[PDB]
Amino acid sequence: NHYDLALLNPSFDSPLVDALTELELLRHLRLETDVHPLLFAQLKSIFHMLESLGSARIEGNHTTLADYVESKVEGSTDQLKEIGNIEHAMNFIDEHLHAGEDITEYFVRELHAMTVNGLERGAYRSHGVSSTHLPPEFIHVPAYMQELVGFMNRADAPKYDLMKVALAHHRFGWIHPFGNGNGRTVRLLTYSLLIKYGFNKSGRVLNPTAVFCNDRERYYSMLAEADTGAVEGLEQWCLYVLTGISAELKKVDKLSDLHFLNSKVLYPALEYSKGRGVINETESKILKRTISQGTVKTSDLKEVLPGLKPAQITYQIGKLVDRGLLQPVEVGSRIYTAGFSKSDLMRGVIHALRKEGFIPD
Amino acid sequence: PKFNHYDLALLNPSFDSPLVDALTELELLRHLRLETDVHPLLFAQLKSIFHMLESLGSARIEGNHTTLADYVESKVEGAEDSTDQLKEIGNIEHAMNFIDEHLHAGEDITEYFVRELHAMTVNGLTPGAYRSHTHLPPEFIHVPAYMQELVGFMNRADAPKYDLMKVALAHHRFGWIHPFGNGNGRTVRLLTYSLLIKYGFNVKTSGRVLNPTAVFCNDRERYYSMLAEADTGAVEGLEQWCLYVLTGISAELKKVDKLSDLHFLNSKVLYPALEYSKGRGVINETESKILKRTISQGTVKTSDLKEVLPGLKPAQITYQIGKLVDRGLLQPVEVGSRIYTAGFSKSDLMRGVIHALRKEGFIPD
């Protein structure tokens, strides 16, 4: 323990306490949303894709949003699989914590195993360091991992939950537990800690990478100050992380407002899609009704398409479902919602999300 | 008894302290933007009812013996405050409305403001003038410099995290100074209500009542025990006084913020208060239907009950409204307007509201 892993204790006059209470406001926020949960579910799928892209690109991945979206909608390369690996790792974190299970040391192992060989067929490093910090000896690593896992799972006061997310993030990289994939794994572990401590009481997307994708140079420069183990360096790291998380939830919480989502994302997405000839005006009219009402039936469009014969309206619904633009709410249901996550409307949504300032590149 | 000097300053506890817990606990509620369906004009009537309770509570602490039933009977019926005791509660209630009308968030609390709080407190019973003359209060020659120091402390642009601690610190130092001859207890409660308004507890909420006397009125020996612990001036005794005040304020905010829910307020307070007047044969059938609409809608105009009273012409509706305005059950929104609200603070409905408030646990006695 060049430095013992312990909780911090700033004075009330410190800016660290300022950021801690700030981020505790957004955790206890009792404001629910008016967005349909079936539309938010597709928004969460899109932002899982954005995080997987961002995390891999931090490690020098060359794939872009166009190439990844193209490989997902319709239609293999090695740089693509590294990214789908992270996407499977986020669904796993979601399902695992939703099933009621906890962040155990083996769960962190399964987290690392998927990040490197997603959905295929874990152990710590048996070698050593390849800055001004020396990763500990490979025989010390299991002890550090056990010391860290027990640290995050201690029943400390919920006021310490967000300081824990910061301390665990640096301590993980300070240990360097695995051979490769530490950067991708520590970001997935931060995501699970964010979900565990209560940021998803189902109307907010969490983008931890967007905090570190912002500056990158400050990210690693703050890690160096924390490597010392001195109180000043660790406090400066927790301030960088917690304020970065605060600024991120500031942005994503706008998508919780139904007016902001419809007017600045969903409705422009169709206008983009219609401008590009992806949908005609009859398909735009039907899809506009879907975002308004949440869902739609064929028997609902008798008045929104009054010049169309009833058989023509039924043909239009079948065309939309086969293309995935409309998707059924339940297996075998004839009640449909918009298809934003797996259809060509995803490009229009990414376009609106890009212009509204949610997507770097 | 002896006067020991003690420096007025902000505390600085560590993150692991219980005081930081209460400080952040209160900061959740100072910044909770509770969206309400309650009409602001309707809430204005409930505002003065809670002014009634604090004024009676602040007066009863300092020896006033009039009961809640006696005070209600002086407002609804009769007219004014003939007894000097009655005037003691009426002075506070008037000063309560003054702070509401003349002090807003962020605005500065001047030394003349605190002096006017004292002048209204003892008006008709030296007013707005300092002492000319356990813990001994400082000599009267030092009171002016101590009050100028306290006002600059309350008005200093210190970080908004310090606002809630400033409420507790200023409350203790004021009584520790004892700047006036009489009415110091009545005044410091008015100053605490002023500080809560200045530090922005009425901004983001259309309807939130704050009863600071209710913190120090549930107990009393504890209120004085925690003050005597703080008169020492030690850092321990001050943090414990702040801890007692902050938790007590947040605990009262928890009880009172339910009244911002229109369904809870209507079902548990306002609609029962209606049937209480109906049960005593104060209102009749049509009058109850009218007042039911005003409660659900917030206000009412004669054209707003064409389908509530279909057999009546608009001129007959107006006669029915005038009967309710004569008895104070309906009140014009402002002078000379033909829009009305339920008179919960002037009519028989005040009695029903107090009963419902007692049943739901807002009034001790």
Numbering used by the authors:
A (entry chain B): 5 to 79, 83 to 128, 135 to 143, 147 to 216, 218, 220 to 379
B (entry chain A): 2 to 126, 133 to 140, 148 to 379
Give sentences from the paper.
Here, we show that Yersinia pseudotuberculosis secretes an effector, CccR, that can act both as a toxin and as a transcriptional factor. CccR contains an N-terminal FIC domain and a C-terminal DNA-binding domain. In E. coli cells, the FIC domain of CccR AMPylates the cell division protein FtsZ, inducing cell filamentation and growth arrest. In Y. pseudotuberculosis cells, CccR inhibits its own expression by binding through its DNA-binding domain to the cccR promoter, and affects the expression of other genes through unclear mechanisms.
To understand the biological role of CccR at the molecular level, we determined its crystal structure using the single-wavelength anomalous method (SAD) at a 2.78 Å resolution. The crystallographic asymmetric unit contains two molecules of CccR assembled into a butterfly-shaped homodimer. The two CccR molecules within the homodimer are nearly identical to each other, as they were superimposed with a root-mean-square deviation value of 0.593 Å over 340 Cα atoms. Dimerization is mainly mediated by interactions formed between the α1 helices and the N-terminal loops of each CccR monomer. Specifically, the side chain of residue K175 from the α5-α6 loop of one monomer forms a salt bridge with the side chain of residue D22 from the α1 helix of the other monomer. AUC analysis indicated that simultaneous substitution of N13 and K175 with alanine abolishes dimerization. The 26-bp spacer between binding boxes is unusually large but is compatible with the 70.2 Å separation between DNA-binding helices observed in the CccR apo structure. As a Class II FIC protein, CccR contains an N terminal αinh (S59ARIEG). The crystal structure of CccR shows S59 and E63 form a stable hydrogen bond with R203 to prevent binding of the ATP substrate for modification.
